[PDB]
Design an enzyme around this catalytic site. Structure first.
Site, PDB file in Angstrom:
ATOM      1  N   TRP A 159      -1.798  -8.000  -3.615  1.00  0.00           N
ATOM      2  CA  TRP A 159      -1.934  -8.772  -2.354  1.00  0.00           C
ATOM      3  C   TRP A 159      -3.238  -9.560  -2.337  1.00  0.00           C
ATOM      4  O   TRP A 159      -3.252 -10.758  -1.972  1.00  0.00           O
ATOM      5  CB  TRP A 159      -1.865  -7.850  -1.163  1.00  0.00           C
ATOM      6  CG  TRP A 159      -2.056  -8.519   0.187  1.00  0.00           C
ATOM      7  CD1 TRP A 159      -1.101  -9.198   0.905  1.00  0.00           C
ATOM      8  CD2 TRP A 159      -3.250  -8.537   0.994  1.00  0.00           C
ATOM      9  NE1 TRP A 159      -1.638  -9.664   2.101  1.00  0.00           N
ATOM     10  CE2 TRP A 159      -2.947  -9.258   2.179  1.00  0.00           C
ATOM     11  CE3 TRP A 159      -4.549  -8.018   0.830  1.00  0.00           C
ATOM     12  CZ2 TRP A 159      -3.893  -9.450   3.191  1.00  0.00           C
ATOM     13  CZ3 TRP A 159      -5.483  -8.230   1.838  1.00  0.00           C
ATOM     14  CH2 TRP A 159      -5.148  -8.926   2.997  1.00  0.00           C
TER      15      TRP A 159
ATOM     16  N   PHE B 293      -7.162  -5.042  10.894  1.00  0.00           N
ATOM     17  CA  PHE B 293      -7.530  -6.360  10.353  1.00  0.00           C
ATOM     18  C   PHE B 293      -8.023  -7.344  11.442  1.00  0.00           C
ATOM     19  O   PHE B 293      -9.034  -8.068  11.275  1.00  0.00           O
ATOM     20  CB  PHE B 293      -6.344  -7.012   9.654  1.00  0.00           C
ATOM     21  CG  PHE B 293      -6.248  -6.717   8.159  1.00  0.00           C
ATOM     22  CD1 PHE B 293      -5.253  -5.864   7.666  1.00  0.00           C
ATOM     23  CD2 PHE B 293      -7.103  -7.339   7.271  1.00  0.00           C
ATOM     24  CE1 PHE B 293      -5.110  -5.662   6.290  1.00  0.00           C
ATOM     25  CE2 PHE B 293      -7.012  -7.131   5.909  1.00  0.00           C
ATOM     26  CZ  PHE B 293      -5.991  -6.312   5.396  1.00  0.00           C
TER      27      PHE B 293
ATOM     28  N   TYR C 279       0.823  -1.246   0.000  1.00  0.00           N
ATOM     29  CA  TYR C 279       0.000   0.000   0.000  1.00  0.00           C
ATOM     30  C   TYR C 279       0.845   1.281   0.000  1.00  0.00           C
ATOM     31  O   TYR C 279       0.530   2.253  -0.702  1.00  0.00           O
ATOM     32  CB  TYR C 279      -0.908   0.096   1.244  1.00  0.00           C
ATOM     33  CG  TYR C 279      -2.150  -0.800   1.266  1.00  0.00           C
ATOM     34  CD1 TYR C 279      -2.672  -1.344   0.118  1.00  0.00           C
ATOM     35  CD2 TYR C 279      -2.756  -1.145   2.481  1.00  0.00           C
ATOM     36  CE1 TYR C 279      -3.864  -2.129   0.147  1.00  0.00           C
ATOM     37  CE2 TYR C 279      -3.904  -1.965   2.535  1.00  0.00           C
ATOM     38  CZ  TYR C 279      -4.437  -2.467   1.351  1.00  0.00           C
ATOM     39  OH  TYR C 279      -5.565  -3.284   1.421  1.00  0.00           O
TER      40      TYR C 279
ATOM     41  N   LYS D 116     -11.030   4.337   3.339  1.00  0.00           N
ATOM     42  CA  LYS D 116     -10.331   5.162   2.342  1.00  0.00           C
ATOM     43  C   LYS D 116      -9.609   6.366   2.959  1.00  0.00           C
ATOM     44  O   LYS D 116      -8.440   6.621   2.660  1.00  0.00           O
ATOM     45  CB  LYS D 116     -11.295   5.639   1.244  1.00  0.00           C
ATOM     46  CG  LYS D 116     -10.642   6.702   0.300  1.00  0.00           C
ATOM     47  CD  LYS D 116      -9.497   6.092  -0.566  1.00  0.00           C
ATOM     48  CE  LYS D 116      -8.807   7.180  -1.447  1.00  0.00           C
ATOM     49  NZ  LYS D 116      -8.042   8.142  -0.560  1.00  0.00           N
TER      50      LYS D 116
ATOM     51  N   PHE E  39     -14.385   5.226   9.976  1.00  0.00           N
ATOM     52  CA  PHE E  39     -14.334   3.828   9.475  1.00  0.00           C
ATOM     53  C   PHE E  39     -14.919   2.887  10.527  1.00  0.00           C
ATOM     54  O   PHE E  39     -15.753   2.023  10.229  1.00  0.00           O
ATOM     55  CB  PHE E  39     -12.852   3.474   9.183  1.00  0.00           C
ATOM     56  CG  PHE E  39     -12.531   2.011   9.329  1.00  0.00           C
ATOM     57  CD1 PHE E  39     -12.850   1.128   8.321  1.00  0.00           C
ATOM     58  CD2 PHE E  39     -11.863   1.531  10.453  1.00  0.00           C
ATOM     59  CE1 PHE E  39     -12.536  -0.258   8.434  1.00  0.00           C
ATOM     60  CE2 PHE E  39     -11.544   0.156  10.580  1.00  0.00           C
ATOM     61  CZ  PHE E  39     -11.885  -0.731   9.585  1.00  0.00           C
TER      62      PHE E  39
END
Ligand SMILES: C=C(C)[C@@H]1CC[N@H+]2CCC[C@@H](C)[C@]2(C)C1
Ligand SMILES: C=C(C)[C@@H]1CC[N@H+]2CCC[C@@H](C)[C@]2(C)C1
Ligand SMILES: [Mg+2]
Ligand SMILES: [Mg+2]
Ligand SMILES: [Mg+2]
Ligand SMILES: [Mg+2]
Ligand SMILES: [Mg+2]
Ligand SMILES: [Mg+2]
Lengths: 304, 304
Positions: B295, B74, B54, B168, B140
């Site tokens: 990925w 994650f 990223y 984002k 988020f």
């Protein structure tokens, strides 16, 4: 616009030249065109050519009826763009009793007598099958001026509405009439998923090729009659891409509908539900999809 | 699943192996993994590897902070799948004051002290840039448990919502932090459209590759936490095609968003509006999009 790969082979009725000359000639005598430019644009569209690509296995003595019907419906489709929803509904509604043969036409008005005489001639040829096209035509006519066109739609909602506005059911009944292909209620009911899938492909292939014409119309014709209502605009807005990008994506989806048609057809047959009439019918729908695309790619109606 | 052609070429941070070992090592030390199978699966995912794809131009002494932040997000993202919307909201809301540093962590609870110590360490490194990541993170977090997830969405409404659920804005702030890339408010306003377009690509590429994992979760985990909310299902439902068909169409749409990125950047430069910081930033966004794809198409997180 480079179309993605398709396994479908379009076919054109063998009498296309002779029937196109006959039917174009008829409308050139009877229909009221504004000028010579319009008469020429009419012949350039090739409305009998598209009909012959839609119904390439029509009986030789029936294909002209289909050509006449789709031709007058194309002409009206264009007139409606200059009308409000209310005016367009009034215009179509007047033609409905005339189509049924219940009300005599005003012979000073070409759309009225063209419609009357056409449907009289279809019933004279095959009353039972001609009658079966009436309600499908009316459902289409009523969808054309439906107020829901002035409300935001998502893609799924649009496709459900557009099955009526695109005339899916009238095209099915007309195909059957033109082939003399009779199906039972049980047979018809069995292929409703195939019908709905096919409707999406017809609609979106048309939306793709007709977009430039329709955008221009939305900027110049009536604010209601000319309203831009198309999958191309809907996907462009939802995905935030250009109309050209939305066409490329939608064409890939059309090929997914082609694969799904094949899968559903295979499934009908593997479930032991494929009759000879149904096999003729679903192959007939395949010609509608591939014929519509081939004509849409070639016709001056969309390229000019 | 064959990706269509793309001109974006991915780049990976040079220190990916050593930072991966450091960061995986920290979480294996501190995080409450349930068993050895889960510890193996965690290393197998490659969360520092995706972070280094990223942000391949991150400063050497900042890339680890970004690996730690994405790694913990994650892990939480997966915990939420076993919770109701209410439980997930309570879980995230506890972490928000801790992230700000306003509330001390319960040191017997790994997620609280991991979150607290990480953000303390980022503020010690670069206070002003670390502060700019907080609200995007919280936006988020709140999207992850929003009841809107359990209500009908069309493709447009989904992408609008998923810009928050995909993180984002936090990824953009984290990218700037990791690179020490300082942009003015007016500079950031100039690229708002480019950010919005980049969010759709990141979202949908993730959706395409993570769909099998998410479908399984939807059938096995919590009916709310694990609810299937993804463009693959949305488009499949709107168009009435399979998930595999939807993925093929969506992948074509992703390439349209790549063309759009290039068009918008070209225009920014043409109008004399691309500063050196903005040039580094938009190139950074392209690495996020290509890195995500590389990925996603190789991680064991999505293939097993
Ligand atoms: C998309 C199609 C199968 C045709 C597009 C043009 N319109 C115009 C009016 C009559 C309709 C049945 C149709 C021929 C459908
Ligand atoms: C599509 C992305 C840019 C990432 C996909 C995976 N998820 C995992 C949970 C935390 C998210 C910020 C993200 C890294 C977004
Ligand atoms: Mg129309
Ligand atoms: Mg029209
Ligand atoms: Mg059209
Ligand atoms: Mg998530
Ligand atoms: Mg997830
Ligand atoms: Mg996902």
């Amino acid at each position: 616009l480079e179309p993605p790969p398709s396994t479908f082979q379009p076919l054109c009725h063998p009498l296309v030249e002779e029937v196109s000359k006959e039917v174009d000639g008829y409308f050139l005598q009877h229909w009221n065109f504004p000028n010579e430019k319009a008469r020429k644009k009419f012949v350039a569209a090739g409305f009998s050519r598209v009909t012959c690509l839609y119904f390439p296995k029509a009986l030789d003595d029936r294909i002209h009826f289909a050509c006449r019907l789709l031709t007058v419906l194309f002409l009206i489709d264009d007139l409606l763009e200059y009308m409000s929803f209310e005016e367009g509904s009034a215009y179509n509604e007047k033609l409905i009793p005339i189509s049924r043969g219940d009300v005599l036409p005003d012979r000073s008005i070409p759309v009225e007598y063209i419609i009357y005489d056409l449907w009289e001639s279809m019933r004279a040829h095959d009353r039972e099958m001609a009658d079966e096209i009436l309600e499908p035509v009316f459902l289409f006519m009523r969808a054309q001026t439906d107020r829901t066109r002035a409300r935001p739609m998502g893609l799924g909602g649009y496709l459900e509405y557009r099955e009526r506005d695109v005339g899916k059911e009238l095209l099915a009944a007309l195909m059957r009439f033109s082939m003399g292909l009779k199906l039972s209620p049980s047979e018809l009911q069995r292929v409703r998923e195939i019908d709905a899938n096919c409707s999406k492909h017809l609609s979106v292939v048309n939306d793709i090729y007709s977009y430039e014409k329709e955008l221009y119309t939305s900027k110049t014709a009536h604010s209601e009659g000319g309203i831009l209502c198309t999958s191309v605009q809907i996907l462009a807005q939802e995905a935030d891409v250009t109309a050209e990008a939305a066409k490329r994506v939608l064409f890939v989806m059309c090929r997914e509908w082609e694969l799904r048609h094949q899968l559903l057809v295979a499934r009908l047959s593997a479930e032991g539900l494929e009759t000879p009439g149904l096999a003729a019918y679903v192959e007939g729908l395949e010609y509608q999809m591939s014929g519509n695309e081939l004509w849409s790619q070639t016709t001056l109606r969309y390229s000019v």
